[PDB]
Amino acid sequence: YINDKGKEVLVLWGIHHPPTIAAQESLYQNADAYVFVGTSRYSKKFKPEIATRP
Amino acid sequence: SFERFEIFPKTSSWPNHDSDKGVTAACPHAGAKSFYKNLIWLVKKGNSYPKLNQTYINDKGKEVLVLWGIHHPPTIAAQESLYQNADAYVFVGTSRYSKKFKPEIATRPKVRDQEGRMNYYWTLVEPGDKITFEATGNLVVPRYAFTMERDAGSGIIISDTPVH
Numbered sequence: 648y649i650n651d652k653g654k655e656v657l658v659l660w661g662i663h664h665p666p667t668i669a670a671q672e673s674l675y676q677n678a679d680a681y682v683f684v685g686t687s688r689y690s691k692k693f694k695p696e697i698a699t700r701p
Numbered sequence: 702s703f704e705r706f707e708i709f710p711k712t713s714s715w716p717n718h719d720s721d722k723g724v725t726a727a728c729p730h731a732g733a734k735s736f737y738k739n740l741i742w743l744v745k746k747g748n749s750y751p752k753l754n755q756t757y758i759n760d761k762g763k764e765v766l767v768l769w770g771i772h773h774p775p776t777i778a779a780q781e782s783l784y785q786n787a788d789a790y791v792f793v794g795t796s797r798y799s800k801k802f803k804p805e806i807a808t809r810p811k812v813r814d815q816e817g818r819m820n821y822y823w824t825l826v827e828p829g830d831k832i833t834f835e836a837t838g839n840l841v842v843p844r845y846a847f848t849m850e851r852d853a854g855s856g857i858i859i860s861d862t863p864v865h
Binding site for chain 1: 792794795796799801830831832833835
């Protein structure tokens, strides 16, 4: 997305952590998944943390 | 209010792992190798480190401070001689806290004769909340947690003045 507006844009996203590997396959078909979000001054790579939380 | 209580009894919580060989010369007691009182350094019970899965529900009426540790061996051989898993992982979870820890196997500068490292972490479990420990290696499990109640606040005085 290129900012054609004349002012700042607030962007919100989320990263999901399934409880089990089976959930990861049932949702995304990729056991070894990754995310990357990048701007000119921002760049981060997110890896799923598949574990059973309380 | 402060009360130390055995969060995980040593004689029953870890039947599959070894809770006796976790002693180092960096923490000596009476000239012999020892370790921290409030923590157990679990190792293999012989060519096997099965999946560790333990939980604790806060039955106390106030906060519970739980401290654990993650061990980073200096060498891959050190990883196998303790946990028999080259790619181990730890996961500590609460209703508000969740973190996955990965060992960083590398040679550090040697301080107190030790080339590996051990990072210490802590958290507060609220009443009615539970903590969960999951591991395939590199976990120093709690032995004693601290039931605690906090007040408004104070400070730490660093001085040699006598106490009367």
